[PDB]
Design a protein around this ligand. Structure first.
Ligand SMILES: *[C@@H](O)[C@H](C[C@@H]1CCNC1=O)NC(=O)[C@H](CC(C)C)NC(=O)OCc1ccc(F)cc1
Ligand SMILES: *[C@@H](O)[C@H](C[C@@H]1CCNC1=O)NC(=O)[C@H](CC(C)C)NC(=O)OCc1ccc(F)cc1
Lengths: 297, 298
């Protein structure tokens, strides 16, 4: 199943940020609160916001930051790309060991969806090849963050900013740079054509085998380049030699050569699933990485 | 999508409990630690244990309870059904508001999977009609708990004890009473044939309607009894009065009476999808409860 990281270390950092009649979430680390800069916009601003111009016209006291029942006093602010950094007069004692990372398409992360500074749910997402994410975000979710946890260190990789007309989601890293060609303005934006994350589909097929499910296997094989020709035809991402190497552990554990699983996936792409299902799904799942599969197995 | 509750309030309650070399997880609330009673078993005792006899040989000082590397001194112990309650000399300062609840089949909950008292991941589970769950549990996961969070309050509903031959999982409520006919012995045990969670399929159809996907709404209705008799022929659960009631909010939100939706579902069962989809799927989903549908749509 899709397993998220335990969210407690991130919950202790969520706060509420209000400017005017706009409220969203902020991430409170040490004495800084990070949040989406469009909190400073009104309606007459969202269509074409000149953020530097809007920001210079704001005072520290226009920002209401609430951590539970407590107001944190903003004593300074600055903007880094699409993120606002509010300096507050109080250190968060719950700040975890952390770093800010920019993730690559195909990598996964956990999302802590929050509303009014309060955590609501946690779930696992992948950065799509077209740099959207298929999230579950509603009004007021902006400033919710995505993260991974290694040992006790939280690597923040995503802050939420918007929902596209197709229902997928877009946002930034914690330096405020969008993933993808998107802009924080209230305009309908389309993404590039999405593709399926092939290395993840293969990891998920190896997972279905580990759990004693192998109806889709076959006795055939393929070269890497011939597989990639078929993959690209079906709008799957190409498989690199690093992907093959990354899949080694799963190949060893199951005794199925990577290119043999590529031949299985080729058959599935060309034949369909013919009503059958894999690990419960009627569709090929591509939001489990090799590491995700390995860890959980 | 399956969305778990934020796990932090439960992370703050996880500890490890060791007897000899047998280690599993425990739940520390106020000054009591709750854990599976088979921690007192040697791997060879698990084949068929006499729990009462094993416990009589135990004393407080035989239990190693640790929050991380910090030992919690045990000052009393008792067995309640299949759980051990270890009184400790420190009240957990991170104890949330909580209650212990026994859930019904079809209800969902979040599982915080733990190993050696350390949380590894959180995911949403549904209690199947045969009283198993499709967990992702490895050796050392026993004592991991399932829960829901309402307002300030953590409702603990599941504690993990065992894996069945088919790979599904079985466990107890926090009073130590197993869900289903299972016992905590290392013997071969089988789950009843499973069935589809009708109330959750209906919730899913309501969610489809809320999203404007409503081709399957027909002009008919049915009685609850007639629907239950048909549904069982398709390996669907019969509905209870409680199921009808928990669909109330979604029925009010859409204006579609519960029994009309039942008639729509009956047609889908009898005639199939005819190649159509619902919410972008030809399969009817049965692991989203009426509450889950509301949680996500709002
Ligand atoms: C958080 O403030 C919010 C989250 C959105 C709301 C619903 N689901 C979400 O993920 N963000 C926005 O509302 C965002 C703000 C702008 C300034 C970046 N815009 C948005 O979500 O809508 C984009 C959009 C604009 C015009 C249009 F025609 C279609 C879509
Ligand atoms: C926790 O102690 C453990 C959880 C099991 C182990 C593997 N995956 C799980 O979910 N419980 C047991 O091992 C349990 C103890 C007895 C007293 C009930 N016995 C059990 O579940 O045996 C089945 C089993 C299957 C696979 C496997 F690898 C190990 C055991």
């Amino acid at each position: 199943r899709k397993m998220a990281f335990p969210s407690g270390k991130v919950e202790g950092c969520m706060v509420q940020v209000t400017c005017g009649t706009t409220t969203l979430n902020g991430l409170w680390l040490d004495d800084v609160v990070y949040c989406p800069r469009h909190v400073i916009c009104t309606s007459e601003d969202m269509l074409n916001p000149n953020y530097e111009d809007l920001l210079i016209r704001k005072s520290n006291h226009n920002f209401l930051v609430q951590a539970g029942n407590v107001q944190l006093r903003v004593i300074g602010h600055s903007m880094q790309n699409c993120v606002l950094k509010l300096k507050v007069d109080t250190a968060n004692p719950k700040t975890p060991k952390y770093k800010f990372v920019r993730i690559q398409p195909g990598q996964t992360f956990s999302v802590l969806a929050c509303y009014n500074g309060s955590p609501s749910g946690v779930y696992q997402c992948a950065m799509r090849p077209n740099f959207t994410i298929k999230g579950s975000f509603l009004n007021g979710s902006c400033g919710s963050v995505g993260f991974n946890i290694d040992y006790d260190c939280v690597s923040f990789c995503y802050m939420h900013h918007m929902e596209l007309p197709t229902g997928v989601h877009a946002g930034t890293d914690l330096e405020g740079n969008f993933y993808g060609p998107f802009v924080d303005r209230q305009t309908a934006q389309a993404a590039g054509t999405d593709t399926t994350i092939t290395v993840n589909v293969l990891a998920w097929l190896y997972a279905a085998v580990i759990n004693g499910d192998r109806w889709f296997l076959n006795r055939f094989t393929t070269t890497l380049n011939d597989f990639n020709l078929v993959a690209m035809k079906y709008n799957y991402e190409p498989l690199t030699q690093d992907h093959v190497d990354i899949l080694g552990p799963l190949s060893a554990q199951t005794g199925i050569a990577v290119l043999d699983m590529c031949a299985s996936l080729k058959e599935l792409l060309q034949n369909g699933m013919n009503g059958r299902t894999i690990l419960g799904s009627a569709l090929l799942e591509d939001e489990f990485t090799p590491f995700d599969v390995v860890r959980q197995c």
